[PDB]
């Protein structure tokens, strides 16, 4: 109170806007392969592990397969393909949002590779990048 209020302070009206947990798109499910459309790893195929509280999807390359480390990715900048891997092998509880502010990636990668081996040619798929060739129309293209 060391200064009397010069002019006046207009208090903001109370806001009836409570934040609620996000409702993700139906295609996104744990163990779903993803295509990243921007950033350092744009056009690179990655695996989906879990959805964080702050609405940043968590993804692993695996770094072993394609050199993409554990990372947070925005959901809207990602395409979801119809091919899946079982994520039950990897537990994915410890690492969280605040944690993001090598050994863990190795632990995750061993379990995820274990499931990757069963499906044919999946490692090659995750290794290679994606791009649009001439004559490719996305709207028909089933991803």
């Amino acid at each position: 109170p060391k200064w009397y209020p010069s002019e006046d302070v207009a208090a903001l009206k109370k806001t009836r806007k409570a934040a609620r947990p996000q409702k993700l798109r139906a295609s996104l499910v744990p163990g779903t392969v993803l295509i990243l459309l921007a950033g350092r790893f744009r056009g690179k195929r990655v695996v989906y592990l879990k959805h964080l509280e702050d609405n940043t999807l968590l993804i692993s390359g695996p770094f072993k397969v394609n050199g993409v480390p554990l990372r947070r990715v925005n959901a809207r900048y990602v395409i979801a393909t119809s091919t899946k891997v079982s994520v039950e092998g990897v537990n994915v509880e410890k690492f969280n949002v605040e944690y993001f502010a090598v050994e863990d990636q190795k632990v995750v990668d061993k379990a995820l590779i274990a499931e990757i081996k069963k499906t044919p040619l999946l490692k090659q798929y995750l290794s290679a990048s994606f791009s649009l060739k001439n004559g490719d129309k996305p709207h028909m293209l089933k991803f």
Binding site: K2, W3, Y4, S6, E7
Partner: protein, 130 residues
């Protein structure tokens, strides 16, 4: 007669009034706290009134009451606000006890601004002395 005086001053020549481009009016009256010609503003319009006004280094408080409406020479009672800002606000509230909130709020604001102006003119005119 304050209402009559105000109505004449409003719909006739308030010589201290200046019509700004926006349409808002400013009374030039030195004693005026809020330099805007309104019902609550013209010291001429209102019998009960107060202002902070600077004389030399001091920031005096001038009081106006209907009792001294006659004898305008002695009308404005002069009170010295203490240099301590907190003490000054306390003295203003005490003297303006049971006094309409408009003049009290405006008086406090004017005291704050005049104190800042005194500080900053001390700033602009700092000299080698002391």
């Amino acid at each position: 007669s304050d209402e009559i005086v105000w109505q004449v001053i409003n719909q006739s020549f308030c010589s201290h009034r200046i019509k700004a481009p926006n349409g808002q009016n400013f009374c030039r009256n030195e004693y005026n706290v809020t330099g805007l010609c309104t019902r609550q503003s013209c010291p001429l319009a209102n019998s009960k009134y107060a202002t902070v006004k600077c004389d030399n280094g001091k920031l005096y408080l001038y009081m106006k009451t209907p009792e001294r409406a006659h004898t305008p020479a002695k009308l404005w009672e002069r009170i010295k606000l203490s240099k301590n800002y907190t003490k000054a606000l306390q003295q203003i509230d005490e003297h303006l006890l049971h006094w309409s909130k408009f003049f009290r709020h405006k008086c406090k604001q004017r005291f704050t601004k005049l104190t800042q102006v005194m500080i900053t003119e001390r700033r602009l005119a700092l000299r080698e002395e002391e």
